[PDB]
Paper text:
Specifically, two SaFtsZ mutations, F138A and T66W, were designed to inhibit SaFtsZ filament formation on the basis of equivalent mutations inhibiting the assembly of Methanocaldococcus jannaschii FtsZ (M164A and T92W, respectively; polymerization inhibition of T92W [unpublished data]). Both mutation sites are located on the “top” surface of FtsZ, in the N-terminal GTP-binding domain, and are part of the longitudinal protofilament interface seen in crystals. For easier reference, the five SaFtsZ structures are named herein in the form #XXx: number (1 to 5), mutation (F for F138A, T for T66W), monomer conformation (O for open, C for closed), and finally the arrangement of monomers within the crystal (m for monomeric, f for filamentous, single protofilament and s for split/domain swapped). Unlike the closed-form T7 mutant SaFtsZ crystals, none of our closed crystal forms contain straight filaments running through the crystals. We know that our mutations compromise filament formation, and we obtained crystals where these mutant SaFtsZ proteins adopt the closed conformation and fail to form bona fide interfaces. Hence, we propose that these closed forms correspond to the conformation of monomeric SaFtsZ in solution. The fact that the phosphate end of the interface is not formed in any of the F138A closed-form crystals supports the idea that it is the closed conformation that is not compatible with the formation of bona fide interfaces, not the mutation per se—because the F138A mutation is within the pseudointerface.
Author numbering:
A (entry chain A), B (entry chain A): 13 to 315
Amino acid sequence: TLKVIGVGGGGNNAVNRMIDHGMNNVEFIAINTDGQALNLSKAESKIQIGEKLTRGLGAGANPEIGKKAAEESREQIEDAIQGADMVFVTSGMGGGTGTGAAPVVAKIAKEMGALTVGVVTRPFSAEGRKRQTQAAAGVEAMKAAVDTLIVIPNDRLLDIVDKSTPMMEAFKEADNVLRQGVQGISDLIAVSGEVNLDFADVKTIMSNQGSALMGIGVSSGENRAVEAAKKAISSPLLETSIVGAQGVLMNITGGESLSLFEAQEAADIVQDAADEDVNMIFGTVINPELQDEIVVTVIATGF
Amino acid sequence: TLKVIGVGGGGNNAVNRMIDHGMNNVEFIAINTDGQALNLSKAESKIQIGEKLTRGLGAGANPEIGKKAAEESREQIEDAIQGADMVFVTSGMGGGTGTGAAPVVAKIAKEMGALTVGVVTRPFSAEGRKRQTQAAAGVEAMKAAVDTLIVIPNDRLLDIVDKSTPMMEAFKEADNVLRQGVQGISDLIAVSGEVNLDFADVKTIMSNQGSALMGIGVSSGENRAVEAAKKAISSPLLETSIVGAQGVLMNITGGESLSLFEAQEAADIVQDAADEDVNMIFGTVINPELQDEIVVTVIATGF
Ligand SMILES: Nc1nc2c(ncn2[C@@H]2O[C@H](COP(=O)(O)OP(=O)(O)OP(=O)(O)O)[C@@H](O)[C@H]2O)c(=O)[nH]1
Ligand SMILES: Nc1nc2c(ncn2[C@@H]2O[C@H](COP(=O)(O)OP(=O)(O)OP(=O)(O)O)[C@@H](O)[C@H]2O)c(=O)[nH]1
Ligand SMILES: [Mg+2]
Ligand SMILES: [Mg+2]
């Protein structure tokens, strides 16, 4: 009676999240151009489009490919729609597959008679200008091919999460913040007994200082070192009041691939942000359970 | 070498979170007045204080009890400190146990020679005026008994989570938002086949409307009905632009205890917020996996 079709990479991930969470009496269909990513989809129906233009590879962030690739497979798409009274076209706008194919997939199911509802997201502004522009063009194309369209701008995703967070889960977040503050110091000073830092350095930093401020920044990807350091500096506690810090304690924790040059980089970032006479000591921790994300946590004292 | 002591209810929950997450080379101690809650603590060291004043019950949000209850057990507290070079006093300020005992526990370990570091949180402003005032008094007492004090105001917890959220986890949140939007409609209309709503009502609401806006609000506790409805109305998509909605679709999902009067209440809240000529239909879903929290999700159309 109801069919939900995830088109694109992020569209498939949302569908897989709809399945892992208990969802019944809905028929799932995964549409994508990445051959490998469709193998990861838990959806019953899987449709690969545009194999002649991509050879099983991704659409390559070009929405013009996504438009044609969906047109080349008009046959198979209509077959999966058959029998549906209402259809959900869930996609992430800004890419090449979802940005181009989702409007096509919508117009097919709409002209086939079903109630076509689009449920899409605008990308984060940090993803670049081109991805935002392509998304805007796709949302306009989506609006002209659906009965109703739901637009989720990722820039306002933080507040949607806040209103959808119960008070029980809120304290669980506060629990993890207290953990990150304590672990950020203990994993740096008392580190078993091969080679690490000592105590007298930490003593001078925190002995009878008084009020302290904390910042946490987690980042991954190419420029993960600069980004994680920037995120930690712009936390509400330290964005306006690290320049007066006379003592700084920094913990950088990363996966197996965490280079030592990457550690000095984030250290130099926090060091420059602090006072000129700052007394900064830092160290590095290798937690392999983190795949390739780093967690820069910094404590500031003095004032 | 390092000891972390969670004093109070929330203090124990943070310690248990420090243990479930892989944390090594630290000695955990749980201090509290709730006899049952200390049975739930995974900490190796457990200390119940003030059994004569509370008989194993909670301190009752009176910080004066927490001060004496920690003084009555000065003996056992000093025994757990012994051998520590640095001690962490993690507590939630605003209560009765943590607000009063944590300053005492800190001054004991500080005069015993260890490096005393306080890691506490201010309560949410939504928790009341008295709990904020008691926390402010306790933070002042904490500051006068520790070497350094870390203050986490829960009002700014949302931004700390944002900077500590990697881009991989950010899309996982967006995945769950798309799920909540689609599930909020499918669980309302096509509901198997005993007794529920029909299709022609949903057809008139969404046929050729165009742009739509979504709001999600999750709440639990005593006044959970009004709160969850208020949270959904003040989402970034609907807080400024539901008054012009000519059609509203509302899904209220709750646990086993979800009363039917509770459903009409939240419906009347959203109904009043919309336009006078609004065409609102709604329904109720019982998901027992939710213990006692409700999830009000609302779709708006028209404009
Ligand atoms: N909900 C959700 N959105 C995502 C996810 N990953 C990326 N996005 C968003 O979707 C936009 C486009 O990414 P994709 O959907 O993967 O692009 P695609 O069309 O599937 O991939 P290409 O065929 O190479 O163009 C990005 O700008 C992100 O904002 C995800 O895992 N979940
Ligand atoms: N980190 C964290 N903080 C919490 C948690 N629960 C409550 N809090 C905060 O702690 C403050 C006081 O709550 P509790 O710590 O439970 O008070 P308590 O002293 O342990 O309990 P009483 O002995 O009855 O006074 C509240 O205002 C909350 O803001 C939690 O689970 N984790
Ligand atoms: Mg992809
Ligand atoms: Mg308690």
